[PDB]
Amino acid sequence: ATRIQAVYRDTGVEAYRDNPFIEALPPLQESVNSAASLKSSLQLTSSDLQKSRVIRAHTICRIPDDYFQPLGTHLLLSERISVMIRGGYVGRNPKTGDLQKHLQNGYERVQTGELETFRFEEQSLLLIGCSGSGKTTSLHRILATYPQVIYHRELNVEQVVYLKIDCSHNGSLKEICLNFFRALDRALGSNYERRYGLKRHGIETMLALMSQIANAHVLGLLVIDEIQHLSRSRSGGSQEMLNFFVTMVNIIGVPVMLIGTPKAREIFEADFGAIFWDPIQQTQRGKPNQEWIAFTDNLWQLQLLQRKDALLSDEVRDVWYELSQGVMDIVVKLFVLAQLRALALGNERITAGLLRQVYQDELKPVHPMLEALRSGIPERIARYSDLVVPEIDKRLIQLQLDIAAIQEQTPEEKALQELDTEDQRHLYLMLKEDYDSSLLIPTIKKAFSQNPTMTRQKLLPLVLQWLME
Amino acid sequence: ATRIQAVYRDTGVEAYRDNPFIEALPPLQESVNSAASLKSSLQLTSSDLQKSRVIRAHTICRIPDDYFQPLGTHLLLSERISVMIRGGYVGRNPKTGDLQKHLQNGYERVQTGELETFRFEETAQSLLLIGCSGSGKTTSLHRILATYPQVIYHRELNVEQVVYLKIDCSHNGSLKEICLNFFRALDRALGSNYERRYGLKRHGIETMLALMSQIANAHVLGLLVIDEIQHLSRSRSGGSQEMLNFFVTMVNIIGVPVMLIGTPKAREIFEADLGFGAIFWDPIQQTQRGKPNQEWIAFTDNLWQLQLLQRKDALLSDEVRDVWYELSQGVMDIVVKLFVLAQLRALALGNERITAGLLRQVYQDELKPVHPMLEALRSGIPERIARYSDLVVPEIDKRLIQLQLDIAAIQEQTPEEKALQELDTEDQRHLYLMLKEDYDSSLLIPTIKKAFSQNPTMTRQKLLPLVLQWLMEGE
Numbered sequence: 001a002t003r004i005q006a007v008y009r010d011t012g013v014e015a016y017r018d019n020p021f022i023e024a025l026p027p028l029q030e031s032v033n034s035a036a037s038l039k040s041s042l043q044l045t046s047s048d049l050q051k052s053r054v055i056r057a058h059t060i061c062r063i064p065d066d067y068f069q070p071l072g073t074h075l076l077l078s079e080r081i082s083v084m085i086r087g088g089y090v091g092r093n094p095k096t097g098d099l100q101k102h103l104q105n106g107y108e109r110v111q112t113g114e115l116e117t118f119r120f121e122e123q124s125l126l127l128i129g130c131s132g133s134g135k136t137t138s139l140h141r142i143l144a145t146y147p148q149v150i151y152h153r154e155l156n157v158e159q160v161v162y163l164k165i166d167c168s169h170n171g172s173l174k175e176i177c178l179n180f181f182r183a184l185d186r187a188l189g190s191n192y193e194r195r196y197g198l199k200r201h202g203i204e205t206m207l208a209l210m211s212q213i214a215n216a217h218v219l220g221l222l223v224i225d226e227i228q229h230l231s232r233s234r235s236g237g238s239q240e241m242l243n244f245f246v247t248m249v250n251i252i253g254v255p256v257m258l259i260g261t262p263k264a265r266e267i268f269e270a271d272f273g274a275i276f277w278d279p280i281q282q283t284q285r286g287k288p289n290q291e292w293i294a295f296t297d298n299l300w301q302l303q304l305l306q307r308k309d310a311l312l313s314d315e316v317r318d319v320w321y322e323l324s325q326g327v328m329d330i331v332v333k334l335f336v337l338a339q340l341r342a343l344a345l346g347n348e349r350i351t352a353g354l355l356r357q358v359y360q361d362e363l364k365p366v367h368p369m370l371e372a373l374r375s376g377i378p379e380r381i382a383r384y385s386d387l388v389v390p391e392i393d394k395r396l397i398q399l400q401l402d403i404a405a406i407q408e409q410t411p412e413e414k415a416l417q418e419l420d421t422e423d424q425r426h427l428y429l430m431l432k433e434d435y436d437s438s439l440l441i442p443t444i445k446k447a448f449s450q451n452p453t454m455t456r457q458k459l460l461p462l463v464l465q466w467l468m469e
Numbered sequence: 470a471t472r473i474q475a476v477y478r479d480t481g482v483e484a485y486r487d488n489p490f491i492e493a494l495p496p497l498q499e500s501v502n503s504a505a506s507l508k509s510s511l512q513l514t515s516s517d518l519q520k521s522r523v524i525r526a527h528t529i530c531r532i533p534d535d536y537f538q539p540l541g542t543h544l545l546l547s548e549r550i551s552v553m554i555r556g557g558y559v560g561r562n563p564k565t566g567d568l569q570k571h572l573q574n575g576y577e578r579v580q581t582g583e584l585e586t587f588r589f590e591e592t593a594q595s596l597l598l599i600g601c602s603g604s605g606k607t608t609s610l611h612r613i614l615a616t617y618p619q620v621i622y623h624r625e626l627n628v629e630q631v632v633y634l635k636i637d638c639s640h641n642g643s644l645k646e647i648c649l650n651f652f653r654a655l656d657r658a659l660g661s662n663y664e665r666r667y668g669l670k671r672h673g674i675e676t677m678l679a680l681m682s683q684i685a686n687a688h689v690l691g692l693l694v695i696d697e698i699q700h701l702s703r704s705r706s707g708g709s710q711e712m713l714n715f716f717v718t719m720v721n722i723i724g725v726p727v728m729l730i731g732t733p734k735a736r737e738i739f740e741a742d743l744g745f746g747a748i749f750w751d752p753i754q755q756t757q758r759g760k761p762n763q764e765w766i767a768f769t770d771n772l773w774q775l776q777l778l779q780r781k782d783a784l785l786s787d788e789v790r791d792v793w794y795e796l797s798q799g800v801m802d803i804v805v806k807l808f809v810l811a812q813l814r815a816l817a818l819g820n821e822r823i824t825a826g827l828l829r830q831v832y833q834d835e836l837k838p839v840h841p842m843l844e845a846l847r848s849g850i851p852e853r854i855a856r857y858s859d860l861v862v863p864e865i866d867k868r869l870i871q872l873q874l875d876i877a878a879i880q881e882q883t884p885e886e887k888a889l890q891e892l893d894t895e896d897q898r899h900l901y902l903m904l905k906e907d908y909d910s911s912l913l914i915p916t917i918k919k920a921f922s923q924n925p926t927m928t929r930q931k932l933l934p935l936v937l938q939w940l941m942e943g944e
């Protein structure tokens with residue numbers, strides 16, 4: 001529940017003029033800018049690199065859910081969503097009564113001579129993409145750029161800017177209306193589910209109710225996600241589903257975004273605008289794509305491996321693309337799983353062979369999708385579009401448990417055990433592969449103990465001098 | 470559809486008097502003033518200059534479609550369109566019925582001595598707007614036609630007056646399609662379905678021209694506009710002569726005014742006969758009779774103020790304006806495109822001023838496909854210009870999207886990413902990654918770069934202290 005008190009902003013567009021709903025909205029520039037700037041990452045100090053394997057594995061398993069890097073498509077989707085929300089409200093001006101009547105009035109005023117100039121001046125969407133591409137998370141982050149509920153004191157309008165409905169696994173069209181009321185309740189503090197969402201009602205009545213409630217709480221955008229989950233058998237076949245969605249758009253009267261997979265596009269082939277959420281491309285315009293390189297370089301810094309390689313090889317990045325094929329779940333999944341297996345086996349360095357072992361063993365269920373993308377054949381890609389890696393969370397727990405069962409110790413882990421203060425161990429890990437640990441650690445401890453006041457930044461050159469003299 | 474119930478007006482002309490189709494039309498001064506006076510554009514404040522490059526670039530890419538400066542050829546075309554539409558209705562007055570019978574009756578009156586003065590005579594004007602692609606013909610046509618209501622309903626006569634109909638030819642065009650698309654366009658303006666009923670692939674062009682005539686006179690059509698004549702395939706339509714016949718026949722079978730918009734290469738179809746009237750949408754000329762053209766000066770100065778750059782050149786220089794004309798050669802698409810693309814290049818490069826070198830750089834990198842035509846315009850050779858008159862820069866909107874995406878990437882680059890790209894060697898990046906936590910980026914990257922620039926072949930191990938020494942205190 002996100003409520004805010006409305007502040008009306010002077011726009012530069014005549015259609016938006018004196019429209020409280022658009023004026024209360026954040027500026028289009030902000031929503032476009034915030035799409036580029038609003039990223040989430042992890043707080044990794046060098047101390048976290050020194051910690052135990054269980055602790056570091058727990059931290060690694062959080063990259064899947066606490067790391068977000070914006071890309072080019074995110075800005076495009078943000079502008080599209082903002083244009084939808086503002087455009088959906090251009091017709092709904094409470095004071096601008098009639099659109100056609102103003103045309104006649106202006107034509108009359110021109111014919112009389114009151115006006116010396118006048119201009120006779122004179123929608124849903126479908127986000128289709130493979131699973132793991134990043135549709136749902138991108139939607140969540142883009143919607144965080146807006147206030148979900150904006151209250152206007154000048155009236156009693158409780159504006160609900162955005163509402164997202166996810167679809168149940170093996171779901172039905174019946175459940176979408178009920179979940180609409182549920183989501184509005186959870187995002188507004190109301191209890192429409194108890195009253196309107198009752199089994200006695202039919203879909204038609206619930207559709208009208210959805211329309212009325214969305215017009216009372218003027219709905220900028222309605223998001224229905226994971227429509228791939230909707231069961232064709234229960235929903236009544238591809239056409240029926242299609243018909244429902246079409247009708248649902250006209251009744252509610254708000255812009256509607258449907259998010260699904262290329263297989264769910266088979267439902268809509270009898271007809272909505274379609275924007276595609278394609279996987280990351282390594283070669284763009286006959287040239288290496290810098291977005292892929294930037295994303296992999298940023299993700300590389302979330303690497304809690306002691307014998308790690310700080311610089312990303314072209315080899316490792318390109319095998320990463322080969323296995324992942326640009327779908328962003330399998331990118332992050334491959335990174336995390338490779339780090340876990342490295343923790344398990346020692347050899348805490350990511351190689352192409354380690355990535356290949358992870359791909360061969362832990363990512364078998366999504367292979368038919370990936371190879372389909374490798375083939376470029378649209379039918380195969382559509383067929384395997386819904387494929388995901390089941391029970392990945394339990395598997396991450398299992399691999400972390402395997403790490404915990406390890407009674408062995410790496411040489412670097414031993415050396416960190418011998419040294420005591422974090423700064424000492426930081427100096428070690430910084431220089432541990434350019435010098436032999438056996439002669440490295442004693443000099444570090446001697447220098448640190450003999451200069452308690454001296455800063456670690458000042459102590460590093462001293463240890464360097466002693467090492468080379 | 471823009472459907473309006475007629476409100477009649479008193480025009481001062483006797484010939485226009487009590488003619489519903491002209492009286493319901495908006496006044497001539499309004500139509501001429503409306504296109505000229507309306508110069509609506511983006512309003513930019515000093516605050517907007519001091520803003521993020523993403524949002525500034527967003528505003529910059531909106532200049533192409535939100536900037537319109539009315540110019541002389543536009544105003545002449547507006548007046549001519551108004552005169553054409555109004556003039557074409559004088560012989561179509563509903564009151565002046567049984568025109569030939571009146572003639573007979575008038576004759577009879579004269580032949581009885583009742584009438585001492587009568588005149589026997591038997592006004593579908595035609596226009597050919599010839600200009601290079603990118604001059605601004607379509608935008609001017611759209612803005613002129615937006616000052617008019619497309620459909621006016623006459624309650625007394627039960628007649629749906631279609632003021633204007635615009636047909637856009639396809640990239641490989643047949644004179645068939647034009648005919649068909651007529652109906653399609655009408656079916657969009659009215660509620661009709663003439664395409665489903667009358668106009669089908671089965672019927673021939675000659676039959677469909679007669680159907681066009683019948684339906685255009687039922688819904689009295691002030692103006693038929695066929696735009697992008699250049700796109701028509703001369704091998705698919707049967708040759709220049711046949712094509713010409715079509716238009717001539719169309720102007721004579723249909724009693725409505727017709728406007729054809731095309732390139733200098735499409736004039737070759739009509740060059741056999743100077744009929745058709747010709748308006749030439751020449752590019753903006755730098756000099757007028759040996760002295761500067763204030764049209765060029767005004768257009769460039771007005772567009773120059775729509776500049777979201779911090780260290781902007783306070784006012785447009787003669788050097789920069791002369792380079793701007795040299796590259797663009799007066800074609801308004803290239804002017805605005807060069808301006809916008811150069812602003813996006815300045816934002817991407819981090820600079821906040823427009824240089825002549827920047828304009829030349831964008832011209833050479835981005836506007837390659839149109840280079841022949843522009844060069845031809847420098848030569849002044851008519852045939853050479855006509856050959857390349859149809860040239861259009863392709864996919865510039867996707868390139869604007871790519872440019873502002875690249876601008877977005879540099880803005881949101883992490884300080885680590887900026888440093889790793891500024892370091893030229895793997896060793897330097899390894900050193901930066903080692904020392905990033907306890908040392909500041911201001912000295913760290915330059916110190917490493919100069920340390921490797923003065924000891925070119927030297928190991929990382931030996932060069933770590935030298936970088937450290939200069940950071941603590943060193944040469």
Ligand SMILES: Nc1ncnc2c1ncn2[C@@H]1O[C@H](COP(=O)(O)OP(=O)(O)O)[C@@H](O)[C@H]1O
Binds near residue numbers: 063130138332
């Ligand atoms: N911008 C991003 N940066 C980093 N990781 C991402 C990003 N977008 C998505 N991911 C990863 O992809 C995973 C799956 O994304 P999800 O929203 O489920 O896509 P879809 O809905 O298409 O299956 C997320 O758990 C997240 O870890």
Ligand SMILES: Nc1ncnc2c1ncn2[C@@H]1O[C@H](COP(=O)(O)OP(=O)(O)O)[C@@H](O)[C@H]1O
Binds near residue numbers: 604
């Ligand atoms: N009067 C004008 N002021 C500003 N820009 C213009 C003007 N006329 C045309 N343009 C620019 O030229 C571009 C294309 O013009 P267009 O109408 O297609 O010319 P043509 O029909 O000759 O190709 C448009 O994107 C528009 O931005």
Ligand SMILES: [Mg+2]
Binds near residue numbers: 131135136226
């Ligand atoms: Mg999904």
Ligand SMILES: [Mg+2]
Binds near residue numbers: 606607696697
């Ligand atoms: Mg054109």
